[PDB]
Enzyme design. Sequence first.
Site, mmCIF file in Angstrom:
data_model
loop_
_atom_site.group_PDB
_atom_site.id
_atom_site.type_symbol
_atom_site.label_atom_id
_atom_site.label_comp_id
_atom_site.label_asym_id
_atom_site.label_seq_id
_atom_site.Cartn_x
_atom_site.Cartn_y
_atom_site.Cartn_z
ATOM 1 N N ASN A 1 -42.956 -28.308 4.859
ATOM 2 C CA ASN A 1 -44.246 -28.445 5.358
ATOM 3 C C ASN A 1 -45.298 -27.684 4.689
ATOM 4 O OD1 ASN A 1 -44.241 -25.632 6.205
ATOM 5 N ND2 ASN A 1 -42.611 -26.046 7.733
ATOM 6 N N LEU B 1 -36.740 -18.478 4.880
ATOM 7 C CA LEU B 1 -37.529 -19.574 5.464
ATOM 8 C C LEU B 1 -37.066 -20.084 6.932
ATOM 9 C CD1 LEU B 1 -37.139 -22.178 2.537
ATOM 10 C CD2 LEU B 1 -38.926 -20.603 3.021
ATOM 11 N N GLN C 1 -36.394 -30.733 -3.513
ATOM 12 C CA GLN C 1 -37.346 -31.122 -2.643
ATOM 13 C C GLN C 1 -37.668 -32.708 -2.892
ATOM 14 O OE1 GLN C 1 -40.643 -28.704 -2.439
ATOM 15 N NE2 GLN C 1 -42.064 -30.096 -0.984
ATOM 16 N N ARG D 1 -39.830 -31.842 -6.605
ATOM 17 C CA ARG D 1 -39.867 -30.033 -7.307
ATOM 18 C C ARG D 1 -38.475 -29.722 -6.791
ATOM 19 N NH1 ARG D 1 -42.029 -24.815 -4.444
ATOM 20 N NH2 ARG D 1 -41.206 -25.724 -2.498
ATOM 21 N N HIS E 1 -39.354 -23.269 8.496
ATOM 22 C CA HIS E 1 -38.858 -24.623 8.182
ATOM 23 C C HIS E 1 -37.862 -25.184 9.214
ATOM 24 C CE1 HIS E 1 -41.282 -24.882 4.567
ATOM 25 N NE2 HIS E 1 -41.178 -23.749 4.550
ATOM 26 N N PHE F 1 -32.387 -22.220 -5.650
ATOM 27 C CA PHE F 1 -33.696 -22.495 -4.491
ATOM 28 C C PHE F 1 -33.342 -23.701 -3.995
ATOM 29 C CE2 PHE F 1 -38.396 -22.500 -3.164
ATOM 30 C CZ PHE F 1 -37.944 -22.268 -1.870
ATOM 31 N N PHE G 1 -36.084 -30.832 1.864
ATOM 32 C CA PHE G 1 -35.481 -30.133 1.048
ATOM 33 C C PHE G 1 -33.953 -29.894 1.318
ATOM 34 C CE2 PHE G 1 -35.582 -25.771 2.302
ATOM 35 C CZ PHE G 1 -36.476 -25.835 3.466
HETATM 36 N N1 I4Z Z 1 -39.087 -14.884 -0.861
HETATM 37 C C1 I4Z Z 1 -40.611 -15.619 -1.382
HETATM 38 C C2 I4Z Z 1 -40.179 -15.994 -2.746
HETATM 39 O O1 I4Z Z 1 -39.167 -17.030 -2.666
HETATM 40 C C3 I4Z Z 1 -39.274 -17.764 -3.795
HETATM 41 C C4 I4Z Z 1 -38.964 -19.252 -3.636
HETATM 42 N N2 I4Z Z 1 -40.205 -19.806 -3.517
HETATM 43 C C5 I4Z Z 1 -40.682 -19.903 -2.145
HETATM 44 O O2 I4Z Z 1 -40.430 -19.462 -0.966
HETATM 45 C C6 I4Z Z 1 -42.164 -20.628 -2.432
HETATM 46 C C7 I4Z Z 1 -43.303 -19.714 -2.597
HETATM 47 C C8 I4Z Z 1 -44.716 -20.205 -2.136
HETATM 48 N N3 I4Z Z 1 -44.910 -21.474 -3.245
HETATM 49 C C9 I4Z Z 1 -44.997 -22.577 -2.485
HETATM 50 O O3 I4Z Z 1 -45.185 -22.930 -1.538
HETATM 51 C C10 I4Z Z 1 -45.099 -23.816 -3.468
HETATM 52 C C11 I4Z Z 1 -46.268 -24.715 -3.229
HETATM 53 C C12 I4Z Z 1 -46.223 -25.895 -3.927
HETATM 54 O O4 I4Z Z 1 -45.359 -26.239 -4.794
HETATM 55 N N4 I4Z Z 1 -47.018 -27.068 -3.799
HETATM 56 C C13 I4Z Z 1 -47.020 -28.111 -4.550
HETATM 57 C C14 I4Z Z 1 -47.424 -29.307 -3.429
HETATM 58 C C15 I4Z Z 1 -48.625 -29.080 -2.792
HETATM 59 C C16 I4Z Z 1 -48.906 -27.852 -2.092
HETATM 60 C C17 I4Z Z 1 -50.172 -27.692 -1.301
HETATM 61 C C18 I4Z Z 1 -50.555 -28.748 -0.655
HETATM 62 C C19 I4Z Z 1 -51.351 -29.680 -1.043
HETATM 63 C C20 I4Z Z 1 -51.782 -30.566 -0.154
HETATM 64 C C21 I4Z Z 1 -51.403 -30.742 1.090
HETATM 65 C C22 I4Z Z 1 -50.491 -29.933 1.680
HETATM 66 C C23 I4Z Z 1 -50.018 -28.768 0.644
HETATM 67 C C24 I4Z Z 1 -48.456 -26.540 -2.755
HETATM 68 C C25 I4Z Z 1 -47.787 -27.609 -0.910
HETATM 69 O O5 I4Z Z 1 -47.503 -26.539 -0.366
HETATM 70 N N5 I4Z Z 1 -46.831 -28.835 -0.564
HETATM 71 C C26 I4Z Z 1 -45.791 -28.375 0.434
HETATM 72 C C27 I4Z Z 1 -45.119 -29.579 0.814
HETATM 73 C C28 I4Z Z 1 -45.779 -30.519 2.048
HETATM 74 C C29 I4Z Z 1 -45.013 -30.984 3.007
HETATM 75 C C30 I4Z Z 1 -45.691 -31.917 3.788
HETATM 76 C C31 I4Z Z 1 -46.966 -32.389 3.880
HETATM 77 C C32 I4Z Z 1 -47.136 -33.297 4.691
HETATM 78 C C33 I4Z Z 1 -46.833 -33.392 5.952
HETATM 79 C C34 I4Z Z 1 -47.334 -34.453 6.944
HETATM 80 C C35 I4Z Z 1 -47.698 -35.231 6.346
HETATM 81 C C36 I4Z Z 1 -48.207 -36.549 7.253
HETATM 82 C C37 I4Z Z 1 -48.346 -37.319 8.061
HETATM 83 C C38 I4Z Z 1 -48.311 -38.371 9.074
HETATM 84 O O6 I4Z Z 1 -49.531 -39.016 9.197
HETATM 85 O O7 I4Z Z 1 -47.376 -38.560 9.889
HETATM 86 C C39 I4Z Z 1 -48.365 -35.502 5.063
HETATM 87 C C40 I4Z Z 1 -48.005 -34.264 4.320
HETATM 88 C C41 I4Z Z 1 -47.513 -31.915 2.821
HETATM 89 C C42 I4Z Z 1 -47.059 -31.034 2.109
HETATM 90 C C43 I4Z Z 1 -44.892 -27.596 -0.224
HETATM 91 O O8 I4Z Z 1 -44.442 -28.057 -1.264
HETATM 92 N N6 I4Z Z 1 -44.458 -26.455 0.733
HETATM 93 C C44 I4Z Z 1 -43.383 -25.222 -0.130
HETATM 94 C C45 I4Z Z 1 -41.967 -25.397 0.234
HETATM 95 C C46 I4Z Z 1 -41.575 -26.533 0.538
HETATM 96 C C47 I4Z Z 1 -40.180 -26.913 0.936
HETATM 97 C C48 I4Z Z 1 -39.449 -25.785 1.269
HETATM 98 C C49 I4Z Z 1 -40.183 -24.355 0.907
HETATM 99 C C50 I4Z Z 1 -41.299 -24.270 0.645
HETATM 100 C C51 I4Z Z 1 -41.859 -23.068 0.359
HETATM 101 C C52 I4Z Z 1 -41.887 -22.363 -0.790
HETATM 102 O O9 I4Z Z 1 -41.782 -23.169 -1.929
HETATM 103 N N7 I4Z Z 1 -42.223 -21.183 -1.001
#
Ligand code: I4Z
Length: 163
Positions: A100, A120, A61, A53, A124, A58, A111
Site C-alpha cells: 500500500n 509491518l 513484491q 521489487r 499492511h 525482506f 508481497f
Molecule cells: N524497519 C524499517 C526498515 O525496514 C527495511 C525494509 N524496508 C522497508 O520497510 C521500506 C522502507 C521505506 N521504503 C519504501 O517504502 C519503498 C518505496 C518504494 O519502493 N517506492 C517505489 C514505488 C512507488 C512508491 C511511492 C509511490 C508512488 C506513486 C504512488 C504510490 C506510492 C515508492 C511506493 O511507495 N509504492 C508502494 C506500493 C503501492 C501500492 C499500492 C498502490 C496503489 C494502491 C491502489 C491503487 C488503486 C486502485 C483502484 O482504483 O482500485 C493504485 C495504487 C500504489 C503504490 C510501495 O512500494 N510501498 C512499500 C512497501 C510495499 C510492500 C511492503 C512494504 C513496503 C514498505 C517498505 O518497503 N518499507
Amino acid sequence: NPLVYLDVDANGKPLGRVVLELKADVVPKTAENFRALCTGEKGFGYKGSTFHRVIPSFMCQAGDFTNHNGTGGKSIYGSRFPDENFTLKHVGPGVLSMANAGPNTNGSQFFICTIKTDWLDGKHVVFGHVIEGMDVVKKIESFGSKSGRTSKKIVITDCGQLS
Ligand SMILES: NCCOCCNC(=O)[C@@H]1CCNC(=O)/C=C/C(=O)N2CCC[C@](Cc3ccccc3)(C2)C(=O)N[C@@H](Cc2ccc(-c3ccc(C#CC(=O)O)cc3)cc2)C(=O)NCc2ccccc2CC(=O)N1
C-alpha cells in the site's frame, strides 16, 4: 479457504508454482480481491505482470499490472479499498500481504515475505500464506538486490484458482 497459484518465470525460464492459501475466514474482502485478480475473471489481473521489487531478507513484491514499477494497480472494487483488519501478523517467510501507500490504499499490489517483517504489523493487511513453492519464492528472492531492482525479469506467466 481459497487456494490460488502463481506460475513464475525468469527471463522466460519457468521457476515453478507458488500455491497460496487465502485467509477468507479472517479477511474475506481482501482475499476475494486477490482471488479474482488471479483468475482473471474480470478481464484483468496478474497474468503477464511482474515481481517488480525484490529485496533479499525482506520480501518479493508484485501486482502492479498497470505501471509495472510499484506506482500502480487496480482493485476489483472500483477504488482503492480500506484496510479490512490487521488481525494476521507478518510472522515469517511465506506470509502474503497487501502492499500500500498508506492507510486504506489497497489495490492489487501484494508481497510475499522472506523473513518475519514484524515492523509491518498494523500497517499492511496480511491475507494468506504460501503452502507450496516456498523454494520458488526463494529463487525469486535470489534475483533481487538491495535497491529491489531484479537481475532478471520475473513474470507471473499464469495464475488462477485451484480450490
Ligand atoms: N524497519 C524499517 C526498515 O525496514 C527495511 C525494509 N524496508 C522497508 O520497510 C521500506 C522502507 C521505506 N521504503 C519504501 O517504502 C519503498 C518505496 C518504494 O519502493 N517506492 C517505489 C514505488 C512507488 C512508491 C511511492 C509511490 C508512488 C506513486 C504512488 C504510490 C506510492 C515508492 C511506493 O511507495 N509504492 C508502494 C506500493 C503501492 C501500492 C499500492 C498502490 C496503489 C494502491 C491502489 C491503487 C488503486 C486502485 C483502484 O482504483 O482500485 C493504485 C495504487 C500504489 C503504490 C510501495 O512500494 N510501498 C512499500 C512497501 C510495499 C510492500 C511492503 C512494504 C513496503 C514498505 C517498505 O518497503 N518499507
